Structures are given as C-alpha cells and as structure tokens.
Amino acid sequence: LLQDTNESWRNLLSTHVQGFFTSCLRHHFFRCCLDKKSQRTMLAVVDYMRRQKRPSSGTIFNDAFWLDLNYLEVAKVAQSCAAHFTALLYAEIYADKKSMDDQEKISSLSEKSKEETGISLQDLLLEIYRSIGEPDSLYGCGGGKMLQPITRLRTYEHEAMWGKALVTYDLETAIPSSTRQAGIIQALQNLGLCHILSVYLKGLDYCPELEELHYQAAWRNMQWDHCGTSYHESLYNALQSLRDREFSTFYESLKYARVKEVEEMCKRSLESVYSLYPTLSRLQAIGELESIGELFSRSVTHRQLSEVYIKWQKHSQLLKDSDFSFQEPIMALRTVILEILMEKEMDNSQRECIKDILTKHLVELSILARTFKNTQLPERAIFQIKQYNSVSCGVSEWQLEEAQVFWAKKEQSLALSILKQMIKKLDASCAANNPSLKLTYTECLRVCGNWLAETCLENPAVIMQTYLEKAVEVASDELRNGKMKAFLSLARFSDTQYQRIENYMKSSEFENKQALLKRQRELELDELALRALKEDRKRFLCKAVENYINCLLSGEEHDMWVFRLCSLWLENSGVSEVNGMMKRDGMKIPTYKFLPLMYQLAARMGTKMMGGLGFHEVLNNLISRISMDHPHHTLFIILALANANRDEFLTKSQLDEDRTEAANRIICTIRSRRPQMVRSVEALCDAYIILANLDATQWKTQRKGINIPADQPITKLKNLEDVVVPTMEIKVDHTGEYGNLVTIQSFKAEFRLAGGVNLPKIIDCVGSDGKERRQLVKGRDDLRQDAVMQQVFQMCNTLLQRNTETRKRKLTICTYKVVPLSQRSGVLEWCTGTVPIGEFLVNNEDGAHKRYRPNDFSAFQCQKKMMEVQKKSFEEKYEVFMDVCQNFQPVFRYFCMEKFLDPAIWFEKRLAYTRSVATSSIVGYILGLGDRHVQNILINEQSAELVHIDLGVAFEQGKILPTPETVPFRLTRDIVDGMGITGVEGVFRRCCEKTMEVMRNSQETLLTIVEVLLYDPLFDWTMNPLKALYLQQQSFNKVAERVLMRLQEKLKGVEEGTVLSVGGQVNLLIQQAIDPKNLSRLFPGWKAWV
C-alpha cells in the first residue's frame, strides 16, 4: 500500500478484506464459520494498519482508513474474538465515520446500521460494555431495548433489586425455562428465603445449571441428604466427607476443584480484570476449606481456633473494597464451616470458644450486609445467633447489632425498645463496673441517645442528662475508641443546642419580639429571659468545646472536627472559659491536627488581648508549638505573613501591624530554636520575591528560554540543605524528625515564560537528588486565594477517598501546591505534562479544530461573530450562537485517540477523563466555582485528567459580574464529546451522582470548613467593581451569611424552594450546563462554542 498508485491496490484490498469480514459474520453457507485464528490474523492486520501514518500525512482518524472498511463489521468480529476494547474503539470509529459521511450530504445510527449492514450499533455497544464489566457504562448504552424483560432483569440483578427481579422472572414466560429458573433460584437465595427455595426446588422435581444450584442450596442449607464434577458439587462433597472424617476424599475433591477452576479461568481470553474476581473468590473459599481440614484432622485447641479466626479477619480486611457478590460466598462458607465444627465438637470447653467465634463471625456478616444496604441477610444472621447463642443474661454485643439491624430496616420503635431494655438491664446488673461490659454499656447509651435525637422522640434535656452525658461518664484501644465516640456524640449534641439557641437569638422573630416591647414588668421579664438564654448558650458552648477537645485527644478518626472546634473558639474569643479550656487541655492536642487550619490560625493572631487567659497569648503559644513541631509546614505561612510588604522594600491598619508583629515574634522564637533554617528560608523568599519583580517585557516574544541575569540573588543560592523544596508536597509526620527530605541544591540558569498579561517566569529547581521541579513564579498577583482553594480541594479529596463508592472509582480533585510569599508575590508548582484545553483545541497554528474539519468556521470567525452579536437582543444572540455551533463541530474526542493507540490504554484514559470531569464539575458547583474558561483548565497528557487552575472566582461571585455566568460548570460540546459516543450518559452521570451523594453525607463538615474559610480576615473572596472590570475586558457579614445559606441549600438539595434527590439535582445541573439558551448569553471570552 505504501507504493500504490491510482489506488488500484487500495480498492482491491479493501473489497477483498470487506468480503472476508462480511463472510465472517454469517450465521451452512458456501463460505462461513471461519476459524478464529484467521479472524485474529485479519484483526491483527487491521490493527497494525491503523497505527501507520499514511503517505499524505493527515490525522490518526485519516490513518485509520488505509483500506476502505466498514468498521461496524470489524468491531463485531473483534467482539466475537473477545477483544472488547478494540471492538469498542472500532465501533466509535465507525460511528464517527458515518457521521462525517452523513454531514457531507445513536438510535438513528443504530436503525440505519441495521438497515444496511444488519447490525445494530446500540446492541453491539451494549454487548461490548457488558463484556467489559464496567458497572457505570451499562447505564448509558442505549434506550431502544429497555422494555425487553431480559434487559430489565439484567438491570435489576446489577442493582441488587432482588424482589423486582423475582417478580419479573415469575411473570415473564417467554424467557427460556433454564434462564428463568436459574434467575428465580438466585433471587430467592439472595433474599434469604432458604426454606422457600428448598421447597421450590422440591416442587421442580416433578440442565447442569439446575444441578449446580441444587448443590449450592444443599451446601448452604446444610441439608447433607441431597446426593465432570462441577464447583459447588465438589464443595458439597468435600463438606460431606469432612463431616464423615474422610480426609482423603476431602483433599482430592478440593484439588480437583482447584484444577478445574484454574483451567476454566485460563481457557478464557483474559481481557478485563473484572472477569477474574469470581474465580479468585472460589479459589479463596477452597483454600480456606483446605486450611480448616488440617484443624479438623488433629485435636482442636483454643489457640489454633483463635489463630485461624485472626487469619480470616485479616484476609477479610484485605477484601475491604471488594463487591458484595464476591465477599458473600466466602462468608457463607465460613458460617457453614463454623456450624459443622460446633456440631462435631463433643467437648463443652471448646464448644464455648467455637460458639464465641461463630457469634463474632455472624455479627461481622451482619455488619457487612448492612454496609451494602442488604436487610434479609442481617436478620438471618441474627436469627442464627439466637438459635446458637441462647441468652438469659440479656446483655451482649450481638443484641446491639440486632438493634442496629432493626434500625436499618426503618423499624425504629423495635430498635429503640430493644436498646432501652438493654440499657435498663445493664444499669440494673451493675454500676458499669464490669470491664467487659463497659464498652457495650457506653455504646448502647450513645447509640440510643443519637437515635432519640434523630427521631425527636425525647426532649434535648432528657437526651443529654440520661444517655450522652451518662455514656461519657461510664467511659485499652477499644476503650479509647469508645471514649472518642462518646465525646464526639456529646460535643455534637451540645453544638446542636448552642446553634439552635444562637439561631433563635439572631432570628427576625426575636428582634420583632424585642421591638414590640420597645414601643413595666414586661421589660423585667424580658431581661430575665435574655439573661437565662445567654447563660444556657454559654453553658452549651463550654460543654461542646470541652467535649470536642476531649474527642481530639483520644483518637484520630474524627480529626476534621478541628475545624468546628476552631470556629467555636474564634467566634467566642472573649469567653474566658473557652480560652481557659483551650489553654489547659487544648494544648495537649497533637500539633499536626491543626495543620489544615494553619492559614486561618495565623491570620487570626494579634497582639491586642495579652494576658494569662487572653485569646492572642494562647493563639501565639499554639502557633509557636505548631511551628516548632512542624517547621516545614508552617514556616512559609508565618514568614509570608511577616513579608506582606517586603516587595517595595526589596525593589527600592492596626490589625495588619499587629499581625506583622505577631508573625515577627513567632519568627524570632523559631530562629532562636532553628537559626540556620530560618535564615536560609528568608534568603530563599527574598530571592524569589526579587526574581518575581524582575521585568520580563524585553523577552516577551522569546519562547526558547532566557538566562537569568547574574545580578539576581537566586543564582547565587546553592546547597540549602536546611530548606525543603517549597513547591513539593510534604507528607505530614507525627514525629518531628523529618530527617530524609529532598532539599534545594541549585537553580538552573535558564528561565522560560508561560505567557499572559503579567508574563510569569518558569524556573527549574534541582533538589538533593538528580530530579528537578519546575516552579511558576508569579508577580503582581494574589495567590492566597489559590492556596485556600487548594486547601478546600484537599479536604474534599479526603472526603472522597474516605467514602467507599468514590474510593472504588478513584474520584479525586487534581491539586497543585501554592506557596504565597507576599501581598502580590508568590510561587506555585508547575504541572508537568499538562496542556491547556484551549491550546489543544482552538490553536490558530495546529489546533484540533484546524487539523480536523478544516472546512468549518475558524475560531477567529466564531469569536468575531459572538463579539459582534453582544449588543443585540437575546433572540439574535441565540440565533448567532446556533449558527456558530452548526459550523463548529466538536473535535476533542481525538485527544485520547491520537495520544493512546492501545485500545485498553485508550479506554482507561477516557474513563479517567470522564471521572475527572464529573468530580471537578460537582466539586466546583458545590463551591460555586466560576471563570472556568478554556485557558483555566489543563489536561495531563500522560493521564488524560483535568486540572483546574486560577481559582480566584468562587462562591458564585461570577454571577454578580456583568454578563453573569449562568452555568454551574463548563459542560460544553467539546467536554461532552471527549466522553465518547454516550456523552454525559452512563459513567459521567453516575460519577456525578456518587460525588453529590458524598457531598450530601458530609454537609456539616463542608459547612464548618467553608465557615472557617469565609470569615478569615485575609481571604478576599467578594467581587468588587475593579475585579469585575478586570475579569471581562457591615454588608460583608450578611453577604457571608447569604453565601453560607446558599451553600447549605446546595448541600441539602434544596433548589428554588424544592427539595430534590441526588439524581434529580444532577439532572438539573447537567441540563442547565448543556442548555444552549444559557450558553448563548455567556461572555464571548468564555468560548461556549468550544
């Protein structure tokens, strides 16, 4: 094909290859049923040709058509050959080619492809996505065959809606009998209806899968009477021989099952990781059975049983993030194992230990099933516990688990009655003196108090005095954890009461009542009531602060509550009790827990209230201790506070000077502790500031790198071993050693320019090792807003990683370290391998919109038209925007196609891109992020993930601008086109739903963090006319309150006075972001058409 002339070879080869692929897709015929080796050879030929640059240069999409091929047939053949990723890639290529060909002259494409080629695109995509195994992708495949019972049943099974699946399986008769009965049996088993399943199987007695389900039910129900060997048949035979003490047959059956499972697994093509999980689960179950075989063989001892249970618990901890469909069979086998061991014990001393092990295992199984929103299995486990662990004492942990299970089923009355009965029995039995029952008593009291607070069935006074304070008073790692939980619960309840009392005091009803008396005993009664209310508020405040301090001491799980504690301390600065308890016991808190709030704590410090219990003295002591323990995390912040006005000094209010004096005092203390490090850090900061102030307009056109002038002090600095690279993230160390950290060695002579109005400078900093880091030095710009926004992003990343659903999908927010140096000077980490999306898409020279679709409108024409239509009415804007969108098609889908040629890598990168878009959009909406234009978003070339920069505009301050921003986030046509053929459907929508659910579940933490951030005196976040003019070429208290209320409404889901579910809110946000009506009214600089 390289030397072909007149396209004779091209035409001949295309015709013959298309004929071959069509012949492969028949079904005998004259030529059909070809061997898979020939199909794989031809697929390899096509794949090799796809990766070769054509003689006419062009693009990768052009390079795909070396031969005229109908890629739908090739994709179907590849799917038949179990090459699912390349099948999806070829289906996407075929869809793109069909769209391009149609433009010259999914459901519509599917029906057209069915009309000519006889293959439905939607059905092929559904089959490929089912074969891949990704759960989210199955939702956006299509809607053509949603009505069919098989698709509905598959959807029900995927979502674990077992009742709906059972009803549909019973109702539909057109389904084949084998599949129908298998689904009925599986749904009955998953619903806990073991007896019903057994009787149903007995009724069916009037295919290998039926016998397989028979054996699975037999071994799960321990019938021991229902008698190539399959898997569950082997397991049942092994259990029967284990009961019969026939160890030879037991080991032989286990070995045969191992061999068969491994052979069946290796016979497959092994394309996706999701195809390996069931085999791994079955092998783990077989291994555990073989492990207990030797324990049964010899004499049973308590130590051996404890060790095997410890091994089981560890290996279950290994499976924390596994799907329930893989964990459940292992737990079932463990339960049957323990039941058999208890049955065949014949020794009272060991029988009690076996009973304890079984009770612990069943409690763990109940907890695991509850974590997956399953209710039948916990009830069955509790029933089994009752059957074995017959109870007459009436106090046990499994009863607390039963109460939790009943609560999970929305039967609050039964759970509350059980828990109150347990509480009364514990109180009657002893005065919390038994060491074993102390934890159970404390947990029962705390849980009952929390449940009563949730259901509003008791007044706050009774709940506080009877349950939560008592739980704290009742209360060695388990005891420490219980103490932490009780302290947190008491602090939360006290904070709730204090917040209720403050909301009442700040409400309009209270002010109206006060003003009514403004117009004689009534005044005295009002004064008495006000004094009583203030006293109650102070008492609740003190209790909440004390319990928060105690909670931070005894654990680390609830560390993010330091935000609420610091907010309570800062707001009530004048209260001596709060300051006193912060000075006495607050200082005992580990210093590393205050690091996320270092910016606010440093900005709040001053020299006004000096005294023994003065707020400023205690705050200065806390800051000094934090800096002493973690100099690398705090020295830059304090020094930047001290160097706010050093820019003018280097070149040539009472609060501000007090803050500067406090920063200087802390700097003097640290220098007294570590002089050399402070001196070196000061020299580095001075060099950075001097470098930033250097004029760069001389080399504005230069792009090959500029040598730093020799007069710059930065070049002189060398071997600073006491200074860590400021732009490098540092892992927090509880110990204050920090011995092994990369240190600054030298700076490369050359520096580059990144473009922009102010012309920032890019420099390279080689560390102690050979690696070097690129740093962006910015002058005449404020980076503190970026720093605090990055802190918010880190907190949101912690929240996302903590939750299981967002951890499985690896939903994260890309962050870069920012180190502000002065009021208008700073330095931040330069992202490597990231190119702006606007640079990739609408570049004038080699943009994607020019290389692909050269006949469409140029970006210059679109910008000119949208700027011209600015002065006209909304109808003219809409018409011009629609006309531009008609002549400006998305091109962004080729980024991953041209950067990643391997279908598997391409699929992974595209999925990562979609997840990054979803997470960034949701998080930015929650924070009210604006100014999300093309130049403010970067995409990493290696990972295909988006990084959001220029975080100046947030909290919906862009909607106050002229030509307000009317979109929650950027979801333009290019962004959706990068997601694939499905668009926003499928992965994107489900990831947005997961992120929004996580945001909803953590509304209090986010509210506390944002409240701490907004009330920071140095955080400038309110829009001003000067900034408004620059962006497009006290009232503060009420504005902050309105912003906090709007954020609370967003987190709760209240949109325009209507409470919405997570899915509905996501649907509203998506439809508002993709609406062309809102996009047309946006600023032309935002580039909505891109």
Binding site: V259, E263, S272, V273, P278, L280, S322
Partner: protein, 134 residues
Amino acid sequence: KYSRGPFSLLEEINHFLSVSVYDALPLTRLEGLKDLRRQLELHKDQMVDIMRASQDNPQDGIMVKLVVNLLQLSKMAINHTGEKEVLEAVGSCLGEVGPIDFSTIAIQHSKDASYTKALKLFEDKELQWTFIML
C-alpha cells in the same frame, strides 16, 4: 540468594517475577510457586502495605501483575506433562490473594523493555522491519 539481608513479601514477589522473566517450561516453576504460596500465606499485613503503596498507580500494581503472570503461566501449561501439578500450585497461590479490588479494568501483559528501546532506536520504517525479522 538470601545474601545482603532477608526478603520481604514485596521482594519475594519481585524475585518471583524476575525469575518468571525467562521461563523455558511451566513445570520448572513448581517449587517457586509453592514458596510464593507459603510466603503469601505467612504475611498478609505486608500484603495490606503493598496494596496501600500501589494505590497511587493501580496500573503498576504488584498484585495484579502477579495474578496475570500466574494466569499466563497456567495458560502455557495446558497440554503438557505437568499440567495438573502447575494448575494446582497456581490455584493454591491465587487462593491467598482472593478477589482484591485492584482498581484496574484493563489487563496489561508484560512487554520487553529492551525491545521497545531497540525499536525506538531505528527511525526508518524499512530498518524496523529488518530488526523484527532478524
């Protein structure tokens, strides 16, 4: 082998993979498979540490690489003298890891690093064909 200090679980798996770089026959790997199974069953806290360390880059995870290497080894053992012995050992070692969430969807088969560098060395299409054929 155990000079310069003992081996941890990660080092044991790395040594197993390095031995697996060149494999004449699957049956010669039986003792290594048994030793790997014993090491895996002895230490699982180190397996938790490995999983935590591999969280940042799940694609380069050690555990998924070991699983796919074992699966390929079992594939190469089909229709040979020691088919069942190798299959049993592979199943024994895969039973230890179990269905751990690897945070990956695409299986990445091992590829020679020297081959890619040698291909990158040649800048002409005809020369690359000569290198591959030779």
